[PDB]
Write a protein that binds this ligand. Structure first.
Ligand SMILES: O=C1C[C@@H](C(=O)O)NC(=O)N1
Ligand SMILES: [Zn+2]
Ligand SMILES: [Zn+2]
Ligand SMILES: [Zn+2]
Ligand SMILES: [Zn+2]
Length: 362
Protein backbone atom coordinates (compact mmCIF):
# COMPACT_ATOMS: atom_id res chain seq x y z
CA UNK A 1 0.00 0.00 0.00
CA UNK A 2 1.28 3.43 -0.97
CA UNK A 3 0.98 6.57 1.12
CA UNK A 4 -0.33 9.75 -0.50
CA UNK A 5 1.52 12.88 0.45
CA UNK A 6 0.77 16.42 -0.65
CA UNK A 7 3.03 18.19 -3.11
CA UNK A 8 6.27 18.80 -1.24
CA UNK A 9 8.14 22.10 -1.40
CA UNK A 10 11.91 22.66 -1.35
CA UNK A 11 12.64 26.29 -0.47
CA UNK A 12 16.38 26.09 -1.19
CA UNK A 13 17.72 24.80 -4.52
CA UNK A 14 20.46 25.90 -6.90
CA UNK A 15 19.40 25.12 -10.47
CA UNK A 16 22.44 26.72 -12.13
CA UNK A 17 20.62 28.28 -15.08
CA UNK A 18 21.62 30.79 -16.35
CA UNK A 19 25.32 30.28 -16.71
CA UNK A 20 26.21 26.99 -15.03
CA UNK A 21 24.18 24.59 -17.13
CA UNK A 22 26.82 21.84 -17.24
CA UNK A 23 26.12 21.43 -13.50
CA UNK A 24 22.31 21.45 -13.78
CA UNK A 25 19.62 23.36 -15.62
CA UNK A 26 15.96 24.05 -14.94
CA UNK A 27 14.95 20.93 -16.87
CA UNK A 28 17.34 18.53 -15.15
CA UNK A 29 17.05 20.06 -11.69
CA UNK A 30 13.26 19.96 -11.76
CA UNK A 31 13.36 16.38 -13.04
CA UNK A 32 15.47 15.66 -9.96
CA UNK A 33 12.91 17.48 -7.81
CA UNK A 34 10.00 15.45 -9.17
CA UNK A 35 11.88 12.17 -8.69
CA UNK A 36 12.44 13.27 -5.10
CA UNK A 37 8.74 13.90 -4.50
CA UNK A 38 9.13 17.69 -4.76
CA UNK A 39 6.53 19.58 -6.80
CA UNK A 40 7.61 23.17 -6.07
CA UNK A 41 11.11 24.64 -5.70
CA UNK A 42 12.51 28.03 -4.76
CA UNK A 43 15.67 28.70 -6.76
CA UNK A 44 18.60 30.67 -5.40
CA UNK A 45 20.03 33.71 -7.20
CA UNK A 46 23.76 32.91 -7.37
CA UNK A 47 23.63 32.11 -11.08
CA UNK A 48 25.70 33.72 -13.86
CA UNK A 49 24.53 36.43 -14.23
CA UNK A 50 23.31 36.52 -10.62
CA UNK A 51 19.68 37.44 -10.07
CA UNK A 52 20.43 40.81 -8.50
CA UNK A 53 18.53 43.19 -10.79
CA UNK A 54 15.28 43.32 -12.77
CA UNK A 55 16.83 42.35 -16.15
CA UNK A 56 18.48 39.27 -14.67
CA UNK A 57 15.23 38.27 -12.98
CA UNK A 58 13.33 38.69 -16.25
CA UNK A 59 15.79 36.42 -18.04
CA UNK A 60 15.72 33.80 -15.31
CA UNK A 61 11.90 33.85 -15.25
CA UNK A 62 11.74 33.05 -18.96
CA UNK A 63 14.41 30.37 -18.73
CA UNK A 64 12.51 28.79 -15.84
CA UNK A 65 9.14 29.01 -17.60
CA UNK A 66 10.68 27.25 -20.61
CA UNK A 67 12.71 24.64 -18.78
CA UNK A 68 11.07 23.87 -15.43
CA UNK A 69 9.06 20.64 -15.12
CA UNK A 70 7.72 21.46 -11.66
CA UNK A 71 6.47 24.74 -10.29
CA UNK A 72 8.85 27.32 -8.89
CA UNK A 73 9.58 30.71 -7.45
CA UNK A 74 12.85 32.59 -7.97
CA UNK A 75 14.78 34.40 -5.25
CA UNK A 76 16.38 37.79 -5.74
CA UNK A 77 19.86 38.24 -4.29
CA UNK A 78 21.07 41.14 -2.20
CA UNK A 79 24.17 42.95 -3.45
CA UNK A 80 26.27 45.91 -2.35
CA UNK A 81 24.49 48.03 -4.98
CA UNK A 82 20.84 47.01 -5.17
CA UNK A 83 19.26 48.02 -1.84
CA UNK A 84 16.37 50.33 -2.58
CA UNK A 85 16.18 49.30 -6.25
CA UNK A 86 14.14 46.07 -6.11
CA UNK A 87 10.77 47.46 -5.01
CA UNK A 88 9.03 47.09 -8.36
CA UNK A 89 10.02 43.41 -8.81
CA UNK A 90 10.26 42.28 -5.17
CA UNK A 91 6.76 40.82 -5.01
CA UNK A 92 7.44 38.67 -8.07
CA UNK A 93 10.29 36.85 -6.30
CA UNK A 94 10.29 34.04 -3.76
CA UNK A 95 12.03 36.45 -1.41
CA UNK A 96 15.39 38.16 -0.90
CA UNK A 97 18.48 36.17 -0.28
CA UNK A 98 21.39 37.47 1.72
CA UNK A 99 24.75 35.69 1.42
CA UNK A 100 26.40 36.81 4.65
CA UNK A 101 29.45 34.55 4.75
CA UNK A 102 32.12 33.85 2.11
CA UNK A 103 30.53 34.42 -1.34
CA UNK A 104 31.10 35.87 -4.84
CA UNK A 105 32.07 39.48 -5.48
CA UNK A 106 28.60 40.22 -6.87
CA UNK A 107 26.70 38.92 -3.80
CA UNK A 108 29.23 39.94 -1.18
CA UNK A 109 28.17 42.44 1.45
CA UNK A 110 31.15 44.04 3.12
CA UNK A 111 29.36 45.67 6.05
CA UNK A 112 26.51 44.95 8.44
CA UNK A 113 25.27 48.42 7.45
CA UNK A 114 24.51 46.98 4.01
CA UNK A 115 22.48 44.24 5.70
CA UNK A 116 20.54 46.92 7.57
CA UNK A 117 19.91 48.80 4.32
CA UNK A 118 18.40 45.68 2.76
CA UNK A 119 16.20 45.02 5.79
CA UNK A 120 15.06 48.67 5.69
CA UNK A 121 14.32 48.82 1.96
CA UNK A 122 13.03 45.37 0.99
CA UNK A 123 9.23 45.39 1.38
CA UNK A 124 8.51 44.47 4.97
CA UNK A 125 5.88 41.84 4.10
CA UNK A 126 8.15 39.84 1.82
CA UNK A 127 10.51 37.02 2.87
CA UNK A 128 14.16 37.49 3.70
CA UNK A 129 16.40 34.45 3.99
CA UNK A 130 20.06 34.38 4.96
CA UNK A 131 23.09 32.17 4.60
CA UNK A 132 24.34 32.97 8.10
CA UNK A 133 26.69 30.61 9.94
CA UNK A 134 27.81 30.61 13.56
CA UNK A 135 27.96 34.14 14.97
CA UNK A 136 26.44 35.44 11.75
CA UNK A 137 23.12 33.96 12.89
CA UNK A 138 23.19 36.18 15.97
CA UNK A 139 24.35 39.17 13.91
CA UNK A 140 21.56 38.91 11.34
CA UNK A 141 19.04 38.37 14.12
CA UNK A 142 20.20 41.65 15.64
CA UNK A 143 19.69 43.43 12.31
CA UNK A 144 16.21 41.92 12.05
CA UNK A 145 15.33 43.22 15.50
CA UNK A 146 16.74 46.67 14.82
CA UNK A 147 14.56 46.84 11.71
CA UNK A 148 11.55 45.23 13.45
CA UNK A 149 10.93 42.32 11.08
CA UNK A 150 11.37 38.59 10.58
CA UNK A 151 14.20 36.56 9.12
CA UNK A 152 14.59 32.97 7.98
CA UNK A 153 17.93 31.20 8.53
CA UNK A 154 19.04 28.84 5.80
CA UNK A 155 20.64 25.41 6.37
CA UNK A 156 21.23 25.38 10.13
CA UNK A 157 24.11 22.96 10.61
CA UNK A 158 25.47 23.27 14.13
CA UNK A 159 24.49 22.78 17.76
CA UNK A 160 25.56 26.39 18.32
CA UNK A 161 23.18 27.70 15.68
CA UNK A 162 20.12 25.65 16.60
CA UNK A 163 20.50 26.55 20.28
CA UNK A 164 20.84 30.25 19.44
CA UNK A 165 17.68 30.07 17.33
CA UNK A 166 15.93 28.13 20.12
CA UNK A 167 16.83 30.90 22.58
CA UNK A 168 15.54 33.54 20.16
CA UNK A 169 12.23 31.68 19.74
CA UNK A 170 11.94 31.43 23.54
CA UNK A 171 12.14 35.25 23.59
CA UNK A 172 9.31 35.46 21.03
CA UNK A 173 11.49 36.73 18.18
CA UNK A 174 10.21 36.25 14.60
CA UNK A 175 12.82 33.84 13.30
CA UNK A 176 12.35 30.61 11.36
CA UNK A 177 14.91 28.18 10.03
CA UNK A 178 15.53 25.20 7.82
CA UNK A 179 17.90 22.22 7.93
CA UNK A 180 19.38 20.31 5.02
CA UNK A 181 19.60 16.52 4.90
CA UNK A 182 23.39 16.35 4.84
CA UNK A 183 23.47 18.03 8.26
CA UNK A 184 21.12 15.35 9.63
CA UNK A 185 22.59 12.29 7.91
CA UNK A 186 26.31 13.03 7.43
CA UNK A 187 29.01 14.21 9.80
CA UNK A 188 32.76 14.46 10.27
CA UNK A 189 32.71 10.66 10.46
CA UNK A 190 31.97 10.63 6.71
CA UNK A 191 34.84 12.88 5.61
CA UNK A 192 37.28 10.00 5.27
CA UNK A 193 34.98 8.24 2.80
CA UNK A 194 34.03 11.41 0.92
CA UNK A 195 37.50 12.89 0.70
CA UNK A 196 38.31 16.58 0.94
CA UNK A 197 36.92 17.63 -2.43
CA UNK A 198 33.57 15.86 -2.43
CA UNK A 199 33.26 16.69 1.26
CA UNK A 200 33.41 20.45 0.62
CA UNK A 201 30.08 22.08 1.54
CA UNK A 202 28.98 25.30 3.23
CA UNK A 203 27.95 25.09 5.99
CA UNK A 204 30.52 22.35 6.46
CA UNK A 205 29.64 18.92 7.79
CA UNK A 206 29.27 18.97 11.54
CA UNK A 207 30.43 16.77 14.36
CA UNK A 208 28.34 13.89 15.66
CA UNK A 209 27.36 16.27 18.47
CA UNK A 210 26.13 18.82 15.93
CA UNK A 211 24.02 16.18 14.18
CA UNK A 212 22.63 14.91 17.48
CA UNK A 213 21.74 18.44 18.55
CA UNK A 214 19.75 19.04 15.36
CA UNK A 215 17.75 15.84 15.92
CA UNK A 216 17.28 16.62 19.62
CA UNK A 217 16.01 20.09 18.66
CA UNK A 218 13.70 19.00 15.83
CA UNK A 219 10.96 21.17 17.39
CA UNK A 220 13.08 24.25 16.53
CA UNK A 221 13.44 23.29 12.85
CA UNK A 222 10.65 24.86 10.77
CA UNK A 223 11.56 23.43 7.35
CA UNK A 224 13.71 20.89 5.62
CA UNK A 225 15.32 22.17 2.42
CA UNK A 226 17.95 20.42 0.37
CA UNK A 227 20.39 23.18 -0.51
CA UNK A 228 20.68 21.23 -3.74
CA UNK A 229 24.02 22.59 -4.96
CA UNK A 230 25.09 20.54 -7.95
CA UNK A 231 28.62 20.60 -9.31
CA UNK A 232 30.19 17.97 -11.56
CA UNK A 233 32.47 15.29 -10.22
CA UNK A 234 35.38 16.82 -12.15
CA UNK A 235 34.79 20.07 -10.28
CA UNK A 236 34.35 18.42 -6.86
CA UNK A 237 37.47 16.27 -7.35
CA UNK A 238 39.64 18.99 -8.92
CA UNK A 239 42.09 21.57 -7.65
CA UNK A 240 39.57 24.14 -6.36
CA UNK A 241 36.52 22.15 -5.29
CA UNK A 242 33.37 24.25 -5.13
CA UNK A 243 31.26 23.66 -2.03
CA UNK A 244 27.93 21.92 -2.24
CA UNK A 245 26.05 18.66 -2.59
CA UNK A 246 23.23 17.62 -4.92
CA UNK A 247 20.28 16.57 -2.82
CA UNK A 248 16.83 16.73 -4.47
CA UNK A 249 16.73 13.04 -5.32
CA UNK A 250 17.95 11.83 -1.92
CA UNK A 251 16.22 14.16 0.58
CA UNK A 252 12.85 12.44 0.81
CA UNK A 253 14.18 8.85 0.85
CA UNK A 254 16.58 9.78 3.67
CA UNK A 255 13.78 11.38 5.68
CA UNK A 256 11.34 8.53 5.03
CA UNK A 257 13.99 6.18 6.40
CA UNK A 258 14.08 8.27 9.56
CA UNK A 259 10.27 8.21 9.77
CA UNK A 260 10.29 4.41 9.47
CA UNK A 261 12.83 4.26 12.33
CA UNK A 262 10.63 6.47 14.53
CA UNK A 263 13.12 9.34 14.57
CA UNK A 264 10.38 11.76 13.53
CA UNK A 265 6.76 11.28 12.54
CA UNK A 266 5.10 11.54 9.15
CA UNK A 267 3.44 14.71 10.40
CA UNK A 268 6.78 16.16 11.47
CA UNK A 269 8.02 15.56 7.94
CA UNK A 270 4.93 17.11 6.30
CA UNK A 271 5.12 20.21 8.49
CA UNK A 272 8.72 20.67 7.38
CA UNK A 273 8.34 19.87 3.65
CA UNK A 274 4.86 21.27 3.01
CA UNK A 275 2.95 23.32 5.57
CA UNK A 276 5.76 25.46 7.00
CA UNK A 277 7.29 26.24 3.57
CA UNK A 278 3.84 27.36 2.45
CA UNK A 279 3.30 29.64 5.41
CA UNK A 280 6.73 31.19 5.75
CA UNK A 281 7.02 32.03 2.05
CA UNK A 282 3.30 32.45 1.31
CA UNK A 283 3.49 29.84 -1.39
CA UNK A 284 0.18 28.82 -2.94
CA UNK A 285 -1.44 25.39 -2.98
CA UNK A 286 -1.02 23.28 -6.08
CA UNK A 287 -4.35 21.90 -7.21
CA UNK A 288 -4.65 18.20 -8.03
CA UNK A 289 -1.08 17.58 -6.86
CA UNK A 290 0.23 14.70 -4.77
CA UNK A 291 3.09 12.27 -4.27
CA UNK A 292 2.73 8.53 -3.73
CA UNK A 293 5.51 6.83 -1.77
CA UNK A 294 6.24 3.18 -0.97
CA UNK A 295 7.49 3.09 2.62
CA UNK A 296 8.59 -0.56 2.58
CA UNK A 297 11.08 -0.55 -0.30
CA UNK A 298 14.67 -0.99 0.91
CA UNK A 299 17.48 0.19 -1.35
CA UNK A 300 21.04 1.48 -1.25
CA UNK A 301 21.90 4.91 -2.62
CA UNK A 302 24.07 4.42 -5.75
CA UNK A 303 27.06 6.44 -6.91
CA UNK A 304 24.80 8.88 -8.77
CA UNK A 305 21.07 9.49 -8.91
CA UNK A 306 19.36 9.36 -12.32
CA UNK A 307 18.49 13.01 -12.97
CA UNK A 308 20.83 15.62 -11.50
CA UNK A 309 23.64 16.58 -13.86
CA UNK A 310 25.95 16.56 -10.85
CA UNK A 311 26.26 12.84 -11.55
CA UNK A 312 27.52 12.06 -8.02
CA UNK A 313 26.11 11.97 -4.47
CA UNK A 314 27.65 12.14 -0.99
CA UNK A 315 25.05 9.67 0.29
CA UNK A 316 26.38 6.82 -1.87
CA UNK A 317 26.20 3.56 0.04
CA UNK A 318 23.62 4.62 2.63
CA UNK A 319 20.77 2.17 3.10
CA UNK A 320 17.35 3.79 2.88
CA UNK A 321 13.78 2.61 3.18
CA UNK A 322 11.10 4.49 1.25
CA UNK A 323 10.87 5.55 -2.36
CA UNK A 324 8.82 7.87 -4.57
CA UNK A 325 6.57 5.85 -6.89
CA UNK A 326 4.36 8.46 -8.56
CA UNK A 327 3.94 12.24 -8.67
CA UNK A 328 0.87 14.00 -10.08
CA UNK A 329 1.30 17.74 -10.69
CA UNK A 330 -1.79 19.83 -11.48
CA UNK A 331 -3.68 16.83 -12.80
CA UNK A 332 -0.92 15.36 -14.98
CA UNK A 333 1.29 12.38 -14.23
CA UNK A 334 4.73 13.93 -13.74
CA UNK A 335 6.82 10.99 -12.55
CA UNK A 336 6.49 7.20 -12.28
CA UNK A 337 9.18 4.80 -11.11
CA UNK A 338 12.19 6.50 -12.59
CA UNK A 339 10.59 8.18 -15.60
CA UNK A 340 9.70 11.86 -15.71
CA UNK A 341 6.59 12.31 -17.86
CA UNK A 342 6.13 16.09 -18.02
CA UNK A 343 8.29 18.07 -20.47
CA UNK A 344 10.49 21.08 -19.84
CA UNK A 345 8.20 24.06 -19.57
CA UNK A 346 5.31 22.30 -17.81
CA UNK A 347 6.26 24.12 -14.61
CA UNK A 348 5.00 27.58 -13.74
CA UNK A 349 6.06 30.59 -11.67
CA UNK A 350 3.79 30.39 -8.63
CA UNK A 351 4.24 34.10 -7.90
CA UNK A 352 2.19 34.84 -11.03
CA UNK A 353 -0.80 32.85 -9.78
CA UNK A 354 -3.47 35.02 -8.11
CA UNK A 355 -3.19 32.89 -4.98
CA UNK A 356 0.62 33.13 -5.07
CA UNK A 357 1.04 36.86 -4.38
CA UNK A 358 2.13 37.68 -0.81
CA UNK A 359 -0.71 39.62 0.87
CA UNK A 360 0.06 43.20 1.87
CA UNK A 361 -1.64 46.30 3.17
CA UNK A 362 -2.60 48.73 0.34
O1 LIG B 1 26.47 28.64 0.24
C1 LIG B 1 26.55 27.75 -0.53
C2 LIG B 1 26.09 27.81 -1.94
C3 LIG B 1 26.16 26.51 -2.68
C4 LIG B 1 26.40 26.63 -4.22
O2 LIG B 1 27.19 25.81 -4.73
O3 LIG B 1 25.74 27.48 -4.85
N1 LIG B 1 26.93 25.36 -2.15
C5 LIG B 1 27.32 25.34 -0.76
O4 LIG B 1 27.85 24.43 -0.24
N2 LIG B 1 27.05 26.56 0.00
ZN1 LIG C 1 23.78 28.81 1.64
ZN1 LIG D 1 17.62 28.52 2.47
ZN1 LIG E 1 22.32 27.51 -1.05
ZN1 LIG F 1 -1.46 18.46 6.03
Amino acid sequence: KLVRLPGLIDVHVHLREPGGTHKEDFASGTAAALAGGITMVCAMPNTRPPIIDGPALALAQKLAEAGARCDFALFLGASSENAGTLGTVAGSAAGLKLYLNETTSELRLDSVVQWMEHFETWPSHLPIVAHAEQQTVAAVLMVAQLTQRSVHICHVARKEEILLIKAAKARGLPVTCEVAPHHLFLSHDDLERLGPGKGEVRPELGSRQDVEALWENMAVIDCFASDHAPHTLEEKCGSRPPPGFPGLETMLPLLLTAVSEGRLSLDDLLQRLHHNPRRIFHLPPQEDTYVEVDLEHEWTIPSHMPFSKAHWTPFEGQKVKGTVRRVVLRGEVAYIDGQVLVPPGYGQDVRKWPQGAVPQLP
